[PDB]
Amino acid sequence: MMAANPWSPVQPSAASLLLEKCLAAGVLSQNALDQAQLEAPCFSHAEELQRITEIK
Amino acid sequence: MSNSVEALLEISSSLKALKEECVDLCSSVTDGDKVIQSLRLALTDFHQLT
């Protein structure tokens, strides 16, 4: 029972805990999840502002 | 973004040009304070001799 290291800055999301449960029950395979991986960029506008601040 | 990057390239070029003009100024920190003391003595002597 992978005891969530309380000190990890990133708390596990409900989605993650659900996915983990599905994988542990053998109903979902990691291969099936990998094939479904969406590389969609998250927060693009915030990233651009960070770069401008550094150059300044 | 495009404006910031162009401003960096301009300032960097201006700095490089000024560093090259100031090559004689960049050598060994001899104790500026010692040279002035010595100069003070020489001037004072010069004045007295004149």
Identify how the structure was determined.
Answer: cryo-EM
Report DSSP letters for chain A, one per residue: -----TT-SSPPPHHHHHHHHHHHTTSS-HHHHHTT-------HHHHHHHHHHHH-
Chains A–B, number of C-beta pairs less than 8 Å apart = 9
Closest-CA distance of chain A to residue B7, Å = 9
Which residue, among A17, A51, A35, A10, has the nearest Cα to B4 in the 3D structure? A51
Asked if residues A23 and A30 have their Cβ atoms less than 8 Å apart, the reply is yes
Q: Which residues of B are less than 8 Å from A56 in CB distance?
A: 4
Which residue, among A31, A33, A32, has the nearest Cα to A16 in the 3D structure? A33
Nearest residue on chain A to B6, alpha-carbon basis: A55
Which residue, among A49, A48, A56, has the nearest Cα to B6 in the 3D structure? A56
Report DSSP letters for B18-38, one per residue: HHHHTTTTSS----HHHHHHH
Asked if residues A55 and B8 have their Cβ atoms less than 8 Å apart, the reply is yes
Q: Which residues of A are less than 8 Å from B5 in CB distance?
A: 55
Give the three-class secondary structure for B1. coil
Contact (CB<8Å) B8/A48: no
Nearest residue on chain B to A49, alpha-carbon basis: B1
Residue B26, C-beta contacts closer than 8 angstroms, at least 6 positions apart: B19
CB atoms under 10 Å from CB of A20, counted, come to: 13
| A34 reaches B (C-beta below 8 A) | no
Give the three-class secondary structure for B7. helix
